[PDB]
């Protein structure tokens, strides 16, 4: 699994691959790992499937639960804290092998400067969190390859479109070097999924646009 | 104990009759909630779930408890089953059971009256549903409108006379504000269950938007 | 505490007498439930288990509690033993015990009257059984019919007069609706325990079907 | 608190006096149970243990609770020690304690009267034992017969007159049914604790067999 | 230990040996392992003695307890379920070495066809149950030999008498190949015990009839 | 039932009437708290959270309990979510619920009246919010000022007369003190929620600082 | 054990073998592993026998329990969730070796397009679930062989009849390569069991039809 | 319950008015405690912590309980935080909370009146603090002196007359003993909080030494 | 990680590096490890990230919680005790590998002599605490190197400015000898963080001042200074 996120001017993008493995065996080709958790946040999760789905589902419920009870959404800091606490709650199980780590992407509507209101937050198994300050992040078995790729490509990010292209290419590089991460499947027509978040909120990126990007990357390297 | 039940029922009845009024009306776009409310932050109308709304009259701390309890119930059910499995009927039913228990076992009855409303899911055709739950757990579904709190008689009639099925938002709002008179932005709390919304139907109508409607 | 018990009995009796009426009749095809019920979605007749049905008169929140309790009891017994081990007698017995406890201990008695009915298992011959449980836990089995809620005398007399053993569904329904009069699709809740069904005997008769029968 | 006790006693006494009657008679075979009982499926006579029997008059849900409690107690003791260690005296003693507690501490006294009977183990000689436990936990052992429920005086007198020690089953039955009159298969519940049974002495006499005995 | 059960036309028969061992040492010669648990069922139990006796005793109590509370006996399915639940209750202890497995034989009075109303049910340590459909079953250290014997002899079963003979011979074969199962002891006059169940009910088979069968089997193989 | 509630309501009201008075006023720089308070160290005005303040009238041990409870609630919420998620409306809501529970279930009702106030976060524009919670859990938010304890009528009238929106700290003090008269450093407790502060808006004015304003 | 499920136009089919083993020993020949759990769902379970039966029985109870309490059946998503939660509840025991995994087949009456309203859902030991999007799935010791067979045969599925055939053939291939999965027993007359679900609900497939399929497959490979 | 608390207040007031008197005064040396006390070994004045002292009037077993409770509280706090964090104000506040809970919830109110006093830490300048806590949890800080138990009016007046700020130990003692008269070593309990001590300020003045100051 | 603290005349300074590692891999370059916990105290924490953040956050809450409840702040001894107790509460977890140790720096407003009212307190995993009497202290993987550096440089501390320089240089030396401690990053523009506390309270040191110090240290050791 690889999940990537990066900030571009005015927002943030998050993308994830589609593969699951049981040892060496490919056990899934269409897993969705990136979830819109509220109007301005998305969560991508690597690790134990059962734990990942619980996180995304319960977290989205918790966010809206607060909003309905209190009449207002949590501040971004609060959203971070709640995710971290949820992750820490799983520590015991994680030590038994049920380990899953979320990556959080968001757009802070309360931020002073809308150009840089994009937020990326990573989490460790004990509930530790870090607000990323270098522009991008990745989690999962191919996260090192994706970050080494983004390190070289990130200077090309100037808008949502280029941000999306860099994210898909980082996923491509992750799949290229990590057998547990899936590349674009042109035969079946299955591609990584992505969410873009800006001032107008979080939206799913159409498969067609990701397919187009994938084809360009492939043609470019041929 | 026959006297005791009689007194509890009187305490609640007398308490709600002293509170400000609220109406819920089925309308072309969904359900409209309108309440006499001077407060800007304290609320008597609220979202419960995707397609389900809540309104209350009476003692605030008491109906706010019930509001929170409902939200707790809904979110739990939706998580344990699926979102689509949470319904207004279900919530109304649970309030009936809750208020019934409170009425007969609490130290003091809750001086509240509640309305639970539900609109169709996006792209479906389904008449809105309005349920009214009273202080003793009695429950009733209404076809067109619900009136709660204070002196309801004039408001109900004023409504039974002017109510038109499938009115526009603006027409529904005036009908409601008028029935209530029997009130500017500063003294009204307004919200709708907008069936046209993709998921969360509840939306408040405040400030400038509300003014243009009055 | 003789006075307190008298007042508790008086309160429950009054509540039930103030409620809408319900009848259950044994018939050739099974058991027929017919209740005065205006509501579209609130129900006073219900499935409990494969061959067992439930009907109630009185305060809705209270008999709905008992309904859910019975379903909980039945499903638990069936799972702990086997489905075939759950019986109407068993359920009636547990309601008797439950209402008895409620009547003496609860803060206020339940204003309810219950009927539990059972039909034969598919392909068996066995007279339907009807049990009536009242607010104090008193229990009685009836051979032919049960009347609950409101003023029962005229209804029971009408039945005592027109009731024929082994009537057809249509004849039974007419007899029942008439006895009740002492009502169209919109004001009736109807269901049967259909002994002809392989497993789940309970089925509602609504809308056009019911309209056609009426 | 003198009055409160008086009222509880009164309430129970009245409830029992209002109920249908039951007799238990020692005979050559062992104990015989005969109760006025219209019901097809609700029982007031039951098997408690291998050589022990139970009969009750009064409010069904209440004596059925006690019946189940006794079976629970007996089966537990037998398992804990040995079957042969469970005795009628033991159960009667436990009922006394239970009803004593109920009478003083429950919200309402139990309107019940119990009989516990025991016959000899297979191949032993031992006079049958009859114990009578009343609503307040008072207990008495009787040599020949026990009468419970409704108006007992005429029934007890009739027995006192026609009762013969070591009577045959048919004679005992006739004596009992007659004493009760002061009925047919359809209105009687009959059972006996049969001494000439290797382990379970309790057996019901119903339908054709009961008719033959009559 | 070996316990066998088989269906014959109109009923079922269950038989068990009499031996107990502590390692290699013979610690008992007269153990009774087959119990009538109600009017229409019998239970045979292999494994830890203390657990086996508890099962049989408690189970019989539970069956009659239901009957006395509810006025009617459990359906056969219900009887199976209760035994399975009781076995599952012992799982923890069984994993510590206190393991015992019941074999259930019964006659279902509610069955449509009285010829085949006989029932045989086996149980695993986790409370799993199986209603046997092949006509016979066996449990214990000799069950494999007992079943390979019945496999060859079962065709000779046409009534209760022949059913009993085959059951006793299966036990004989088990004792012949398994030192932990005891054969007929002609010197002491101790034989396997058996129960036959039919429409009339469950009854203990007289020692004398089993002794006669044993002698015939022995003479036949001499 | 009904009578008991009235008495608890009378006991609390009288106690509140007997206590010294407190006022809270919205002003240009935030919210001003002024209380009649002779004590050197016992306080009736207090910080709750960053932008949230507390003032009380009545029995000290009782409102101090509530003060401590509020601080506990706020600090806990802030830690579990984020500081910015703690609001004056939220605290007022929790006091309403708490006092409501206390009023119906405690042995004696709390003889207290609470004010919760909130000012804007540094560099934001937001009208101050003033909430008043009474002994029975009733809650209301005021636009301009709140008066609690003793005889409030003259004080409220004086404020209704002299109150100007957005007065300077000095002018607000004059209006407050004067209204209270209907009082030297030694008999006044003064503090403000100063919206100009970066994080902790609460600050006491005492001694020389108080002197400049007077 | 092998349990297969596949979608065909208008519905779904699920089939399972009949074998149980205790190590190398064949301990059962007639085990039924596919259960109709409500009017529109079926569950097939591989793994610990005791756990599998509990799942199927309890699950069907829970589904109908909700229906009776609430007056309406769970949505399909809800049915999935309840099964997942039930599996999760067994995790501790599963880690002690009492592991069982359900495969869920259903027909979603609320789906927009009835042609593709068939549903197949797989579950892992921690309660993870996946709605299968590739048309078929399998669980158990022979699931690899079954899936590799379906990979080649699935293109032949155009209706319930051909769907059933492919399912039975996948089971046949599983039994051919996995000794813990049982093939058709022509001597005893025991065959895999199957359930078909379409708009008219879930029904058991008659043994006779499966036997016929088995014979055709066998004759086809004799050649 | 108006009368309930009314009666509780009467009972406590009477008990205290019936007890022997105690005074606490601030002097240049520190704080001086003087109580009417015949007993050789039963004490109504006590150390609480380094700079904090305790004096009580009323029912001994009751104020001794509070004395121990205070010591427990003080020692517990100094260990959880630091010694310097324990203050007389903190102790007075806890006594208020405690008596308030006792007054409303105990079977009988405590018939006690407490004084908590604190002097400066060694080498610091800080006016002594005196706190008076009454039976209902009411609390007050006094600048110069506190009088408790018996008929306080004459004693308080005598003090109000003769009290001089910063009087010597001998002068303070005489003033106090005299005010009390409105007395010899054998009928007085005397102690001081001596601000001149390095850590533990509490010291008793008994026997010959006490005689010397008289 | 390395966190240093030292007393100078009139106050105390605390500084921490910015690095986090997962084994050999650099996992972070901008971690902030020094927190102002009230008006007169700062806490720096080395060890498990999750535990470190909890400590700082909860501790600050606890301090202000007491102040609001009691109307007055804890004495400095009290602040020490509460931190120690919090650390002890984590002992069980720490023995499972979730270990974090705080270093506490403060200015005691109640101290007799304001020149030496600066306080430095260290803590062990069992809640043991020590008020440092030698002028400086450090915690973390580079703490030995930092302390051996301060041992030589501390004599140069005569005011807040020189105190800050020595602290930054000690961090520099720690990074130089410990791969788990990060040095000044001139390419990215990331530097150690610092807090200074004196009679006027605790304040964050501006990045620009630390950057300037780092550059001077660097130039001094190149010889570019010469």
Swiss-Prot record, chains B, C, D, F, H:
Q: Name one Pfam family in it.
A: Proteasome
UniProt keyword Cytoplasm, yes or no:
yes
Ways its activity is controlled: The formation of the proteasomal ATPase ARC-20S proteasome complex, likely via the docking of the C-termini of ARC into the intersubunit pockets in the alpha-rings, may trigger opening of the gate for substrate entry. Interconversion between the open-gate and close-gate conformations leads to a dynamic regulation of the 20S proteasome proteolysis activity. In vitro, chymotryptic and tryptic activities of the proteasome are both completely inhibited by epoxomicin and by the peptidyl boronate inhibitor MLN-273. Also inhibited by Mg(2+), Ca(2+) and SDS.
Task: Tell me if Mitochondrion is a UniProt keyword of this record.
Answer: no
Quote the protein name from its UniProt record: Proteasome subunit alpha
Q: Where in the cell is it found?
A: Cytoplasm
Phenotype on deletion?
Cells lacking the core proteasome prcBA subunits exhibit reduced growth and persistence in mice. They are also attenuated in interferon-gamma-deficient mice. They also display increased sensitivity to reactive nitrogen intermediates (RNI) and increased resistance to oxidative stress.
Subunit and partners:
The 20S proteasome core is composed of 14 alpha and 14 beta subunits that assemble into four stacked heptameric rings, resulting in a barrel-shaped structure. The two inner rings, each composed of seven catalytic beta subunits, are sandwiched by two outer rings, each composed of seven alpha subunits. The catalytic chamber with the active sites is on the inside of the barrel. Has a gated structure, the ends of the cylinder being occluded by the N-termini of the alpha-subunits. Is capped by the proteasome-associated ATPase, ARC (Mpa).
Other information? Was identified as a high-confidence drug target.
Q: Which family is it part of?
A: Belongs to the peptidase T1A family.
| Pathway(s) of this molecule | Protein degradation; proteasomal Pup-dependent pathway
Post-translational modification here is noted as: Phosphorylation enhances proteolytic activity of the proteasome.
Curated annotation (Swiss-Prot), chain G:
Instruction: Indicate how activity is controlled.
Output: The formation of the proteasomal ATPase ARC-20S proteasome complex, likely via the docking of the C-termini of ARC into the intersubunit pockets in the alpha-rings, may trigger opening of the gate for substrate entry. Interconversion between the open-gate and close-gate conformations leads to a dynamic regulation of the 20S proteasome proteolysis activity.
GO BP field:
modification-dependent protein catabolic process; proteasomal protein catabolic process
Pathway terms, separated by semicolons: Protein degradation; proteasomal Pup-dependent pathway
Q: Where in the cell is it found?
A: Cytoplasm
Task: Specify the superkingdom.
Answer: Bacteria
In alphabetical order, the GO MF annotations are:
threonine-type endopeptidase activity
E.C. number(s) listed in UniProt: 3.4.25.1
Where exactly are the transmembrane stretches of this chain?
none
- Where are the active-site residues found? 1 (nucleophile)
Asked whether the UniProt record includes Secreted among its keywords, one would answer: no
Q: Is Cytoplasm tagged as a keyword?
A: yes
* Catalytic reaction list: Cleavage of peptide bonds with very broad specificity
Which UniProt keywords are given for this protein, alphabetically ordered? Autocatalytic cleavage, Cytoplasm, Hydrolase, Protease, Proteasome, Threonine protease, Virulence, Zymogen
GO CC list: cytoplasm; proteasome core complex, beta-subunit complex
Function according to Swiss-Prot or TrEMBL: Component of the proteasome core, a large protease complex with broad specificity involved in protein degradation.
User: Family assignment?
Assistant: Belongs to the peptidase T1B family.
UniProt subunit comment = The 20S proteasome core is composed of 14 alpha and 14 beta subunits that assemble into four stacked heptameric rings, resulting in a barrel-shaped structure. The two inner rings, each composed of seven catalytic beta subunits, are sandwiched by two outer rings, each composed of seven alpha subunits. The catalytic chamber with the active sites is on the inside of the barrel. Has a gated structure, the ends of the cylinder being occluded by the N-termini of the alpha-subunits. Is capped by the proteasome-associated ATPase, ARC.
Q: What is this protein called?
A: Proteasome subunit beta
Organism listed in the record: Mycobacterium tuberculosis (strain CDC 1551 / Oshkosh)
UniProtKB/Swiss-Prot annotation, chain I:
> What keywords sit in the KW lines?
Autocatalytic cleavage, Cytoplasm, Hydrolase, Protease, Proteasome, Threonine protease, Virulence, Zymogen
Q: Gene that codes for this?
A: prcB
Q: Where is the active site?
A: 1
In alphabetical order, the GO MF annotations are:
threonine-type endopeptidase activity
Species in which this protein is naturally found:
Mycobacterium tuberculosis (strain CDC 1551 / Oshkosh)
- Record note on quaternary structure: The 20S proteasome core is composed of 14 alpha and 14 beta subunits that assemble into four stacked heptameric rings, resulting in a barrel-shaped structure. The two inner rings, each composed of seven catalytic beta subunits, are sandwiched by two outer rings, each composed of seven alpha subunits. The catalytic chamber with the active sites is on the inside of the barrel. Has a gated structure, the ends of the cylinder being occluded by the N-termini of the alpha-subunits. Is capped by the proteasome-associated ATPase, ARC.
Q: Which reaction does it catalyse?
A: Cleavage of peptide bonds with very broad specificity
Pathway(s) this gene product operates in, as recorded in its UniProt entry: Protein degradation; proteasomal Pup-dependent pathway
| Entry keyword Cytoplasm | yes
The EC number of this protein is 3.4.25.1
Family (UniProt): Belongs to the peptidase T1B family.
Activity regulation, per record = The formation of the proteasomal ATPase ARC-20S proteasome complex, likely via the docking of the C-termini of ARC into the intersubunit pockets in the alpha-rings, may trigger opening of the gate for substrate entry. Interconversion between the open-gate and close-gate conformations leads to a dynamic regulation of the 20S proteasome proteolysis activity.
Q: Which GO terms describe its cellular component?
A: cytoplasm; proteasome core complex, beta-subunit complex
Q: What does this protein do?
A: Component of the proteasome core, a large protease complex with broad specificity involved in protein degradation.
One biological process term from GO is:
proteasomal protein catabolic process
Compartment(s) of residence:
Cytoplasm
- Kindly indicate whether the keyword Protease belongs to this entry: yes
- The entry's protein name is Proteasome subunit beta
